[PDB]
Ligand binder design. Structure first.
Ligand SMILES: Nc1nc2c(ncn2[C@@H]2O[C@H](COP(=O)(O)OP(=O)(O)NP(=O)(O)O)[C@@H](O)[C@H]2O)c(=O)[nH]1
Ligand SMILES: [Mg+2]
Length: 171
């Protein structure tokens, strides 16, 4: 009977919605419809024999109201910071995203970096080593993911949930 509120953040087009759609619905769609408003999906997993309800919030990387939507960080217990390995800009922007988390989220929020679209290695711009190094510099975890090929999607969410649970259980 745990309830963990998670938030996906990162530039438009990196695959936040698709990563969640794989996790929650076990499917992949190649269409790109930028996310409208803010909403969640629910999936309950089991850790250490306990039921962990994950309420995972998704909103657009839309720039227009980005200064206002920093409001959303406050309620997050864990945050996935997503970039696209085929898009250097999305990775360059992770620094700015992490500063927003530090400014607006709880100091103890759990954070993970996802380098998504790792199935499109033929268009890779960001080396895995650079993603690993960025994560190293902030002391947080890193995975390359693919919503399409179903690479590390379960792993990412279970790992983030396990880290939230471990901190919580130390009370
Ligand atoms: N090849 C491949 N394409 C992916 C992957 N994940 C997402 N995409 C594609 O990338 C595009 C953007 O995905 P989407 O999930 O909408 O991105 P988003 O980060 O939610 N965008 P927004 O912030 O505007 O809502 C879509 O065409 C989608 O199919 C992936 O793992 N592999
Ligand atoms: Mg989206």
């Amino acid at each position: 009977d745990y309830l963990f509120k998670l938030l996906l953040i990162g530039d438009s087009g990196v695959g936040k919605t698709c990563v969640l759609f794989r996790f929650s619905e076990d499917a992949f769609n190649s269409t790109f419809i930028s996310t409208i408003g803010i909403d969640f999906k629910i999936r309950t997993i089991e850790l250490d024999g306990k039921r962990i309800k994950l309420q995972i919030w998704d909103t657009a990387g839309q720039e227009r109201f980005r200064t206002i939507t920093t409001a959303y960080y406050r309620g997050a217990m864990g945050i996935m910071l997503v970039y696209d390995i085929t898009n250097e800009k999305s990775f360059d922007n992770i620094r700015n995203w992490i500063r927003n988390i530090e400014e607006h989220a709880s100091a103890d929020v759990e954070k993970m970096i996802l380098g998504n679209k790792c199935d499109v290695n033929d268009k890779r711009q960001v080396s895995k080593e650079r993603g690993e190094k960025l994560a190293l510099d902030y002391g947080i975890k890193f995975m390359e993911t693919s919503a399409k090929a179903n690479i590390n999607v379960e792993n990412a969410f279970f790992t983030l949930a396990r880290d939230i649970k471990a901190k919580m259980d130390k009370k």
